[PDB]
Amino acid sequence: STGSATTTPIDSLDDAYITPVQIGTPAQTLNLDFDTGSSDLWVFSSETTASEVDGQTIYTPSKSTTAKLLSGATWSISYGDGSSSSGDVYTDTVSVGGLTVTGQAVESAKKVSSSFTEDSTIDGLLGLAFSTLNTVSPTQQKTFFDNAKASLDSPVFTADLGYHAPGTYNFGFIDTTAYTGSITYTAVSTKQGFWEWTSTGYAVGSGTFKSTSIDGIADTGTTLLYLPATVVSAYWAQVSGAKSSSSVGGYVFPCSATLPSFTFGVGSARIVIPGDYIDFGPISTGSSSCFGGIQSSAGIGINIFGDVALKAAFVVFNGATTPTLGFASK
């Protein structure tokens, strides 16, 4: 089997991407944030505290003939941005882009933090990291991808995120028309439950490539590119007036600037992030200070190849027995 679904930016900054997902019988379609940095499929639901729901579409298990309470199971998750959610668990039929899993754990939110409530466009998350990170207790549950894997033509999914435009998540096949040149594959460590890999270095603009190992995670659920302070300082030094602002929470730059590109290495290959992808616009409406899309990972504890980096590439998440990641230009 295979699946193919379009993923769409939630706003004009590509802050996140939503993908329609069918849950239950008859189908209830919710727009979920596919997150390769976590491993829970959770939704706003008929159980979510009413004051914490503001415009989201909810899953109502009592209206699904295939929903079953997973008795005694609870879940609770906290994300790197400080947001969180928790609740109980149903199993139900879940379909993405024509690919159906029966018996998928659908985590029903009883509580969500403010950032989720305030984002009316995101109806929940669909985790695509390794199932060892799944938070369901006392019986850990599998991700949609892990459940689908045996049925897939090939044990892979791909992320093809757009810049200010829709893109695609495919399951079970590699669309050879969706990228240019060749795909370069690189080793993954699953020790921390993430799609963790080592970039071979970077360049700023037209500058020389610096060969240096940068361990980090491929994370579709993180907006920006978070890299070591040395690397980030080298980038922003090439932008007149750019500075790190503790009051704002990172690097800002004059909105009149033209940003240089940023290149990262994948083995001997190179992925180029255009300068425009690094512009996250005014820090507040009407401001001439703009927020940067490359930020320091210092104090996160991990480097994160988020959407800024991933949307510059066609990315293969290879879930074979020995997992790997592939990157191609597009």
Swiss-Prot record:
Q: Which reaction does it catalyse?
A: Hydrolysis of proteins with specificity similar to that of pepsin A, prefers hydrophobic residues at P1 and P1', but does not cleave 14-Ala-|-Leu-15 in the B chain of insulin or Z-Glu-Tyr. Clots milk
Q: Coiled-coil stretches, from where to where?
A: none
Q: Does the keyword ATP-binding apply?
A: no
Assigned keywords, A-Z? Aspartyl protease, Disulfide bond, Hydrolase, Protease, Signal, Zymogen
Organism for this UniProt entry:
Cryphonectria parasitica
* Enzyme nomenclature, EC number: 3.4.23.22
Name the encoding gene, please.
EAPA
Family of this protein:
Belongs to the peptidase A1 family.
Instruction: Indicate what this protein is called per its UniProt record.
Output: Endothiapepsin
List GO molecular-function terms, semicolon-separated: aspartic-type endopeptidase activity
Catalytic residues in the record = D35, S199
Instruction: State the disulfide connectivity.
Output: C255-C290
| UniProt domain Peptidase A1: residue ranges | 17-328
Any one GO BP annotation for this protein = proteolysis
Q: What class of enzyme is it?
A: hydrolase
